[PDB]
């Protein structure tokens, strides 16, 4: 686990180099973004229960065969384990958003998650549908004003969409 600032230092140390002036200014504008990054993380954790339980409700409506007897999410424990995995992935994606780096997300959330779902028999293509339903439920909740000053957050919301896409290809 290393953030976006330590990712630059880890690359410079293997070269034996100081950080040049064009690299410090690329890091001084990450500080300038700053408050806009913490506004995104505040908005996806304050609604973190609503992101999971709405995207789950919209996933068994499109795929009703998951909750039929014989489906992978039919029982009390198999339904609660379905909502559990979505909260874990959403937890680690917000860790990578506050870090600026997807290192913590694939260190300890995505390593072996694909081979876990093959062992259990869980359809990993339907798990990817659930990550994408949590993606746009939190992308749309990032770019609404609602107590924030007006400005451009377009590069940070594109960064947050990249973590949801990385988790959705590392699962199937």
């Amino acid at each position: 686990m290393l953030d976006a600032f330590a990712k630059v230092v880890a690359q410079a140390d293997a070269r034996g180099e100081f950080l040049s002036n064009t690299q410090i200014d690329a890091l001084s504008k990450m500080v300038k973004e700053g408050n806009q990054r913490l506004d995104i993380v505040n908005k996806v954790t304050s609604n973190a229960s609503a992101i999971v339980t709405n995207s789950a409700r919209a996933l068994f409506a499109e795929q009703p065969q998951l909750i039929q007897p014989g489906g992978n999410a039919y029982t009390s424990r198999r339904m609660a384990a379905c909502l559990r995995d979505m909260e874990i992935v959403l937890r680690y994606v917000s860790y990578a958003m506050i870090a600026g780096d997807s290192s913590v997300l694939d260190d300890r959330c995505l390593n072996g998650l694909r081979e876990t779902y093959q062992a259990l028999g869980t359809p990993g293509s339907s798990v990817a549908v659930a990550i994408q339903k949590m993606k746009d439920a939190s992308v749309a909740l990032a770019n609404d004003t609602t107590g924030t000053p007006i400005g451009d957050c377009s590069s940070l919301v594109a960064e947050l969409a990249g973590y949801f896409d990385r988790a959705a290809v590392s699962v199937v």
Binding site: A14, D101, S103, D106, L110, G112, R166
Partner: peptide
């Protein structure tokens, strides 16, 4: 997609290894 099993991502040791002493990763 993901780093090899066990390797902490972004903290590999073969980063700037020269060719004359590079070890192929099993």
């Amino acid at each position: 997609q993901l780093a090899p099993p066990g390797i902490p991502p972004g903290e590999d040791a073969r980063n700037n290894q020269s060719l004359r002493q590079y070890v192929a990763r099993p």
